[PDB]
Design a protein around this ligand. Structure first.
Ligand SMILES: *[C@@H]1O[C@H](CO[C@@H]2O[C@@H](C)[C@@H](O)[C@@H](O)[C@@H]2O)[C@@H](O[C@@H]2O[C@H](CO)[C@@H](O[C@@H]3O[C@H](CO)[C@@H](O)[C@H](O)[C@@H]3O)[C@H](O)[C@H]2NC(C)=O)[C@H](O)[C@H]1NC(C)=O
Ligand SMILES: *[C@@H]1O[C@H](CO[C@@H]2O[C@@H](C)[C@@H](O)[C@@H](O)[C@@H]2O)[C@@H](O[C@@H]2O[C@H](CO)[C@@H](O[C@@H]3O[C@H](CO)[C@@H](O)[C@H](O)[C@@H]3O)[C@H](O)[C@H]2NC(C)=O)[C@H](O)[C@H]1NC(C)=O
Ligand SMILES: *[C@@H]1O[C@H](CO)[C@@H](O[C@@H]2O[C@H](CO)[C@@H](O[C@@H]3O[C@H](CO)[C@@H](O)[C@H](O)[C@@H]3O)[C@H](O)[C@H]2NC(C)=O)[C@H](O)[C@H]1NC(C)=O
Ligand SMILES: *[C@@H]1O[C@H](CO)[C@@H](O[C@@H]2O[C@H](CO)[C@@H](O[C@@H]3O[C@H](CO)[C@@H](O)[C@H](O)[C@@H]3O)[C@H](O)[C@H]2NC(C)=O)[C@H](O)[C@H]1NC(C)=O
Ligand SMILES: [Cl-]
Ligand SMILES: [Cl-]
Lengths: 605, 214, 605
């Protein structure tokens, strides 16, 4: 895939620096269009960053900050759109790279960057950085007033080499010959927003951005608005003319391209767009395919459980005792769940009591989270996450720190117990620094994820080779060695049969306590009135008409405890009176009343 | 694969009526354009009536207008010709055909309608045996039947070449009579006998007379 | 009417050159705004083209190609919008006019053309064309980058005369004095997109295109966006202010004007626009007026039959044996039907069998086509188009070749048989080269068409004076000499009475087989139990209570076959036993049971 999420962690120091770069790597490996912000922060000196080399286009901002690395290989980046801005002003922010052989970014090397659509540039405190003052930023900007939002520090600890002798007019992104700045705006003819040269015939189509290779709207280096299968357009496709032409029907607007159908975890709108959140007056219906769609409520919209980052909890940063009751009986939360140290310690500033462990019971019904699950603190009483026993999907439509849909850190649970979890819609999982936690690598994460660009990042849990004995590794009866915790009630898939929650070797088909039939690998009880059979099948189903033989009397076709004595199967039906045989089959009574009948007959009717 | 198999012919008294079927396979009669064509013995082809069942357009020749009704049942995929108040000069072989381009491409086999006052008579079949060469002839005699036609085949249609079935002759008695012969090697007599299969439909007679050298 | 459709046939050689110009003539006669592409192709030398002289405005492109004619009189054309482009690039394409006294276009004479909103100009291979290189195209273009999409060949077989001495600065569209180029852009003051002169006070309103006669937004020569009853506006008309002003309520956006109600064959949207196709999640309801409107589905949208040029058949060019079954039981197709030689011959490249004639049965239920019907091949077995027996309307919302809603060519059917066809919503009908086909001129086309700008174009069918005898002309009983084929079952209107499908002289009112009453010119059967009357009316309706006299017994108020004998008209009603009179009237029985009664009474109750 070419389109990937950004991050949203700004200048915050990494939650686990051990696996921070791995996060970045998985996130951007192969990615071309970053649907969000490109944040390259806190990168060590030797850092291998070749996974960035396909990034062509960024929607949000680009933030390169707090790095000791000498260069970030972003040579193919053509356009940042600035749909979101750093510090609400900047589309490109290069901050604090290197301390106040030596560490720090030396060159920018954004050799292809020829369009910043919105916001300015902020470059500050980079003691090793050269050539940033060289660039004619005006050209890159879409409008000139973006110059008024630009601050470029040139304080520097080293002398810079000149631009390559092969450089046009002393403007470059680095010492290389292919590092010269390519001007596509200020160097143009007549009208022309972008040109490939100074002649009128070198103008790019009205609909290009960054530049072009020719005059047609298919020669664009970037689309100003929308990419319709290699053609830049103002809109995603009411007809006026009496005909039909090629280029398929109508499309959904997803990011800055028109696409046939919305990508995996998104939602199609009536307005004709893809989204991770529906508008007001709108539900969310699942098609038989699994496809999701926002649509207007026919009645007044029914009750909806909003999690964090949604509705009244949009500012609220964690599940506390103040809002825990809001999730009572919720099968599906629209938003995220976050449990922080402050959840269980309880903020003593506000009159908010520390949340007690048994209050987490509210989540027992929970099956779906649209946002993310984040657990950085958990009660020391609880050995596992069994309160989330029934959670099936975490969509990850909202990702914690813009990257993780499931984070478990610093917990000291011994096992997971998330035994219904079958899907992580999108985003990465992070499970780190849980010193007691086993059963992390007995989970088939490959099957929980959807796209193959997501992964589990793990470090400083209980060592894998130390999860070996009983109560520390999967039970014998777990199929393919997969489980969420210890014992035959924690298997992902069941090797043999299930009796309720438990994996069992055999059902009691031929021998045992109460006899059983099997149905879809499930042990299920015969009817009490079935007669257990010697080494043979006792029953075929749960109903009393499915016995091989009756334990007491038989009342065609049922095995009964006693023969009917004045029962009426319903109103308006006359009562049914019966008596047993020498064999045991219930027999109908004769002439009505006087001798109301039973075995040897009784009066009183 | 496109076929028209017609039926319903036979004997009728003057003034009486008769209905002819024309069952189709390989195409829909309803959307098609079905035509009836007759041929009095020893005469040219004569157009009789037609039908475009879907459009409802039915057409008749001045000769038969008011006496004949053309129709079609769609479910049976069959066209019919109802003929009332029949007369001597209605005696003919009636064909049904399918319009195509601007001709009739698929035709029925043709059924024979005979308008007469004489009643149906069954044929008696008599053997014609060779005597005491190189190549010798044998055959059957289908004598005294009415009306036409009679079908003669040999060994259930297995023997074809050498066979001559003569066109029937009208006798002084008003009944028909024909002979059907076949030539076979004079060294085949005895250990190779031949059966002629006479069929006079109007009387329901299926005679299998084995001819033997005697 | 002023607004007309374009064509969409590009460089394709005319399907019948005999009546090609007549097509153009009917299409454009009186037309001012071309809602589509203006394609003037393959015009012979003497061609009379004065019908183009009112064209003022073109939405799509203008394609003048393959003509031997010396000029096209397009002097009033002010603006081409380029909503559609030729070869995806060009708004004006003038190609191959004249061979590689002599034929060919000599001058362009677009003396009023002062705005091309989108796309460039392509002028090539016109050996007689002069002055095209003279024009300052930059002025006409809306943006300068449109220059980069311009190719103007000047290879020429003749010397050109100079522009009229009265020409500004040697720029003209022809030798005439009124042929000089009027510059409205490059010659302007200050800001100003269009001006009527070089002073600041000569600027046209922000909302004009092509130029103007004054500064007000009512002085525009063309509207840049929308024409609101002589006022150019950015939008078609949520209120903020506490008042009410003139200029009627709100409008629908149709083409580039705001109108009160959508034109005849269009569809109004909730979004407030006219269209020939509804969006997804949308049906199409007919108001009691006959007015059509797109509206959201309250339930999930029900099954819909899509024809060609729609949904999965949008690329498919003809009805074949591969998709014939898709139309089973369709009463109304949304799209078009096309039957081509390849339909019945069957493409042997793909494993697609030739379509058999009896497979066309699927269309027997069909009543409506939104698109067009096109038949260029038909099975030789079928004498007519009776499979389309029940087709009532062909809307023509999509027109074949952008012009025809009904085309019948090269068929060799003998008659039409489209006996339910009452409406051709829009577009022309073309019926040509059917050498055997009569009953073409016995159809009242004047009544099938809606606007009087549409017509039937016919040539090389069976001569009119050769459709004279029986089976070749209308039946005596057809009213006004109108019919779809031969016989009293093909009349358009029925002269006397209808018995089912057939036109008849008289109903069997006074005499005949089974007696009949008449109801709305329809012969209908009396009840079998009615007694036929001597030269008098036999019944008044179909019910057995509507007889003049009974054939058997009477059971008030019904004529019955036999008197009721233990019938109960419903449950909970006691059975009704009766007996006949000497006259014949059914009489009620006496005391209940013992003598259960009938005529002379019977036991067993
Ligand atoms: C270039 O850098 C100088 C400072 O020089 C040095 O490098 C920096 C990256 C820091 O590590 C500095 O500690 C170091 O000296 C910047 O000059 C400084 O600018 C600020 C305003 O932006 C001046 O304001 C002062 O602020 C202090 C503390 O708030 C007050 O006490 C002062 O009264 C005064 O208002 C400051 O004077 C000045 N520093 C010096 C050395 O005098 C400079 O901003 C930077 N250039 C750019 C373009 O970013
Ligand atoms: C003006 O016209 C000339 C050609 O002159 C003549 O008029 C034309 C309308 C045609 O009828 C020609 O057959 C006739 O000679 C155009 O010049 C031609 O241009 C093309 C490229 O556009 C040249 O390319 C050639 O292509 C051929 C075949 O593919 C190759 O074999 C050659 O190797 C070569 O690549 C071609 O050389 C050239 N023709 C001549 C005569 O040499 C010209 O394009 C046109 N001007 C404009 C502005 O349209
Ligand atoms: C606008 O978006 C379209 C998507 O429809 C882009 O077209 C795609 O771009 C690729 C790469 O430029 C094209 O080439 C192909 O690339 C793939 C992967 O690298 C390679 O395997 C193929 O051999 C081929 O070279 C291709 O036209 C097209 N790819 C697909 C699968 O749709 C286009 O790049 C975008 N343009 C702009 C203006 O941003
Ligand atoms: C914008 O559209 C409006 C339509 O509301 C146009 O106004 C119409 O234009 C005509 C012709 O210019 C005007 O004059 C009238 O013409 C008719 C027909 O030629 C003639 O019979 C009358 O005598 C009269 O002169 C009239 O104002 C108006 N017509 C009607 C019936 O609405 C206007 O032309 C368009 N303007 C632009 C900027 O394109
Ligand atoms: Cl480095
Ligand atoms: Cl001319």
């Amino acid at each position: 895939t070419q389109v990937c999420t950004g991050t949203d962690m700004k200048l915050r120091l990494p939650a686990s620096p051990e696996t921070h770069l791995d996060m970045l790597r998985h996130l951007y490996q192969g990615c071309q269009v970053v649907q969000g912000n490109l944040e390259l922060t806190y990168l060590p000196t030797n850092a291998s960053l070749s996974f960035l080399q396909d990034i062509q286009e960024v929607q949000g901002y680009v933030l390169i900050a707090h790095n000791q690395v000498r260069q970030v290989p972003l040579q193919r980046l053509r356009i940042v759109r600035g749909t979101q801005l750093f510090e609400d002003n900047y589309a490109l922010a290069v901050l604090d790279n290197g301390d106040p052989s030596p560490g720090g970014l030396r060159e920018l090397q954004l050799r292809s960057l020829t369009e910043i659509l919105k916001g300015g540039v902020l470059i500050q405190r980079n003691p090793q950085l050269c050539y940033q003052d060289t660039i004619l930023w005006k050209d890159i900007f879409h409008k000139n007033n973006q110059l008024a939002l630009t601050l470029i520090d040139t304080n520097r600890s080293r002398a810079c080499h000149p631009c390559s002798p092969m450089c046009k007019g002393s403007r470059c992104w680095g010492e290389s010959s292919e590092d010269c700045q390519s001007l596509t705006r200020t160097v143009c003819a007549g009208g022309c927003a972008r040109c490939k040269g100074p002649l009128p015939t070198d103008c790019c189509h009205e609909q290009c951005a960054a530049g072009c290779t020719g005059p047609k709207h298919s020669d664009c280096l970037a689309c100003l608005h929308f990419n319709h299968s290699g053609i830049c357009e103002l809109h995603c496709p009411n007809t006026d003319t009496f005909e039909s032409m090629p280029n398929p029907e109508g499309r959904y607007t997803f990011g800055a391209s028109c696409v046939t159908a919305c990508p995996y975890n998104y939602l199609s709108t009536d307005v004709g767009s893809c989204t991770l959140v529906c508008p007001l007056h709108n539900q969310e219906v699942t098609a038989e395919d699994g496809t999701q769609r926002c649509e207007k409520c026919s009645k007044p919209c029914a009750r909806v459980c909003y999690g964090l980052g949604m509705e009244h909890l949009r500012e609220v940063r964690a599940v506390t005792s103040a809002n825990i009751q809001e999730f009572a009986g919720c099968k599906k939360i629209f938003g995220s769940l976050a449990f922080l140290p402050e959840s269980f310690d309880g903020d003593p500033a506000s009159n908010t009591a520390p949340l007690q462990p048994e209050q987490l019971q509210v989540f027992e019904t929970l099956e779906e989270i649209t946002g993310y699950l984040y657990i950085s603190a958990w009660p020391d009483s609880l050995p596992d996450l069994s309160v989330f026993q029934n959670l099936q999907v975490i969509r990850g439509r909202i990702l914690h720190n813009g990257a993780y849909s499931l984070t478990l850190q610093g917990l000291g649970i011994s096992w997971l117990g998330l035994r219904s979890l079958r899907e992580l819609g999108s985003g990465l999982a992070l499970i780190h620094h849980n010193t007691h936690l086993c059963f992390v690598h007995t989970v088939p994460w490959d099957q929980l994820f959807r796209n193959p660009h997501q992964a589990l990042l793990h470090t400083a849990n209980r060592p894998e080779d130390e999860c070996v004995g009983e109560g520390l590794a999967c039970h014998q009866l777990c199929a393919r060695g997969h489980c969420w915790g210890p014992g035959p009630t924690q298997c992902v898939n069941c090797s043999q049969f299930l009796r309720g929650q438990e994996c069992v070797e055999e059902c009691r088909v031929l021998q045992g306590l109460p006899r059983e039939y099997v149905n879809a690998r499930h042990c299920l009880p015969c009817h009490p009135e079935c007669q257990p059979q010697n080494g043979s099948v006792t029953c075929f189903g749960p109903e009393a008409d499915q016995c091989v033989a009756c334990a007491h009397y038989k009342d065609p076709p049922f095995c009964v405890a006693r023969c009917p004595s004045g029962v009426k199967p319903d109103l308006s039906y006359m009562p049914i009176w019966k008596f047993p045989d020498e064999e045991g089959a219930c027999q109908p009574c004769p002439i009505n009343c006087t001798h109301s009948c039973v075995d040897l007959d009784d009066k009183g009717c | 694969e496109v076929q028209l198999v017609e039926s319903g012919g036979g004997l009728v008294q003057p003034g009486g009526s008769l209905r002819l079927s024309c069952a189709a396979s390989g195409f829909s009669i309803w959307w098609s354009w079905i035509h009836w064509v007759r041929q009095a013995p020893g005469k040219g082809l004569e157009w009789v009536a037609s039908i475009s069942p879907s459009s409802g357009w039915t057409s008749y020749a001045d000769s038969v207008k008011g006496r004949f009704t053309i129709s079609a049942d769609t479910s049976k995929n069959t066209a019919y010709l109802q003929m009332n108040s029949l007369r001597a000069e209605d005696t003919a072989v009636y064909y049904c055909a399918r319009w195509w381009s601007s001709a009739m491409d698929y035709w029925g086999q043709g059924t024979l309608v005979t308008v007469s006052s004489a009643s149906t008579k069954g044929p008696s079949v008599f053997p014609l045996a060779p005597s005491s060469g190189g190549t010798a002839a044998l055959g059957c005699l289908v004598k005294d039947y009415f009306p036409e036609p009679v079908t003669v085949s040999w060994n259930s249609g297995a023997l074809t070449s050498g066979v001559h079935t003569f066109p029937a002759v009208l006798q002084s008695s008003g009944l028909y009579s024909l002979s059907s012969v076949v030539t076979v090697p004079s060294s085949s007599l005895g250990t190779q006998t031949y059966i002629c299969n006479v069929n006079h439909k109007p009387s329901n007679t299926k005679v299998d007379k084995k001819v033997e050298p005697k």
